[PDB]
C-alpha cells in the first residue's frame, strides 16, 4: 500500500486581511482538492491539546445507565426525536465504536426550526453536569471554535474556485447551520470482536467501509493512530496521521455544485486495535441553503446541474450512508 500526498497547509492567512496571502493558501487548497482531495490545515489556532483526553474520559466515565438515557432512536425506542443527536452505543462482542453526536447549540425549544419540527433539526441532549463537570461547556465552545476554523477554510475554498471569499461562508451561519460534531471512541479490545471487523474487496480489514462524506467539507481532528485511506485510480493510499492538524476534505455537496471539479474523495477506515479518539466536524449549511452549481472547467462556467437545497441533501445523505455502511 502506497501513501497519499496530503500537504500541510498553513491556513492562518485565511483569518487575516492579506488578500494575496489568502490567494496563495487558496492555490494550495485547489491543488490538494484536485489531487487526493485531502490536506492538513496547520497553524489553525484551535487548542487541540485536551480534545483527546476529554473525549476519552467522557466515553470511559459515562455509564450504561447514562448511555441509555442519552441514546439516539436507533438504540432507544423512547427517543423518537433523537435521530442525529445523542449517544451511539457500542455492542460488546459485535460493535466496537461508540460515539456522541451533537448539533448547533442554538437549536433550543425556542428556535424557529425546532418549533416548526423541521427534519434534521434537534435539541441537543447532554449528560448530568455533576457526573460530567464542564463537559457541555467544553463541547459547545468546541463547536464554535471549529465553526470559526471552518468559516475561514470556506473562504479558502471559495477563492480557490474563483469566487469571492464569502461564496460558501455566507450560507454558513451560527443561527441555522446543520453542522455536527461527533466525539468517537475507537477502543482497544482483546480479543477484538470479529463481527466488528469488515473485510474489503482487496482484503484490507476495516472498521468503516468506503464512502463519500455527507457534507460541504469535513474538518477532522484525530488521535495519532494511522487509519484512514483515500481511494485513487491506483488504489487505496494510506493517509498519515497528524495529531496537531485538522484533516480537511470535500463532501458530496461540494462535488455536486462544482460539477465534480472538486470530487468528494472516497475513503475508508482501517481496523487498528488501538485506543483512539476521532472528532469530525461536518460542515453543513442551513436547511434552505442553495448554492447554484457551476463548472470551473468551462470558459463560461455554466453547469446544467440542478441547485440542491441543503436540508433535503442532508436528509437523503444521512439515511443513504446508514443503509450502505450500517448504523453507527
Ligand atoms: C473518519 C470519521 C469521519 C469517522 N466516520 C464518520 O464520521 C462517518 C463517515 S464520514 N460519518 C457518519 O457516519 C455520518 C455522521 C453524521 C452525524 N450523525 C450527523 O447527524 O451529522 C470515523 O472515524 O469512522
Ligand atoms: C489525543 C490528543 O489530543 N493529543 C494531542 C495532540 C498534540 C497537539 C500533539 N498534543 O501533544 C497532544 C496532547 C499529544
Ligand atoms: Fe468520511
Residue numbers in the entry: 4 to 331
Can you provide the manuscript's text about this entry?
Isopenicillin N synthase (IPNS) catalyzes formation of the β-lactam and thiazolidine rings of isopenicillin N from its linear tripeptide l-δ-(α-aminoadipoyl)-l-cysteinyl-d-valine (ACV) substrate in an iron- and dioxygen (O2)-dependent four-electron oxidation without precedent in current synthetic chemistry. IPNS contains a distorted double-stranded β-helix (DSBH) core fold (cupin or “jelly-roll” fold), which is characteristic of the 2OG oxygenase structural superfamily.
To support the proposed association of the 19F NMR and DEER studies with the tr-SFX analysis, we carried out crystallographic analyses on the spin-labeled IPNSS55C–Fe–ACV complex under anaerobic conditions and after exposure of single crystals to NO to give a spin-labeled IPNSS55C–Fe–ACV–NO complex. In the spin-labeled IPNS–Fe–ACV–NO complex, it appears that α3 is rearranged (>80%) compared with anaerobic IPNS–Fe–ACV. The new conformation is the same as that previously reported to be induced by O2/NO binding to the metal ion. NO binding apparently changes the conformation of the ACV valinyl carboxylate, which induces rearrangement of S281 on β11, in turn causing changes in the conformations of the adjacent residues Q280 and V282 with consequent conformational rearrangement of α3. Crystallographic studies on IPNS show that, at least in one case (α3), labeling of S55C does impact neither on the overall fold nor on the conformational changes induced by NO binding.
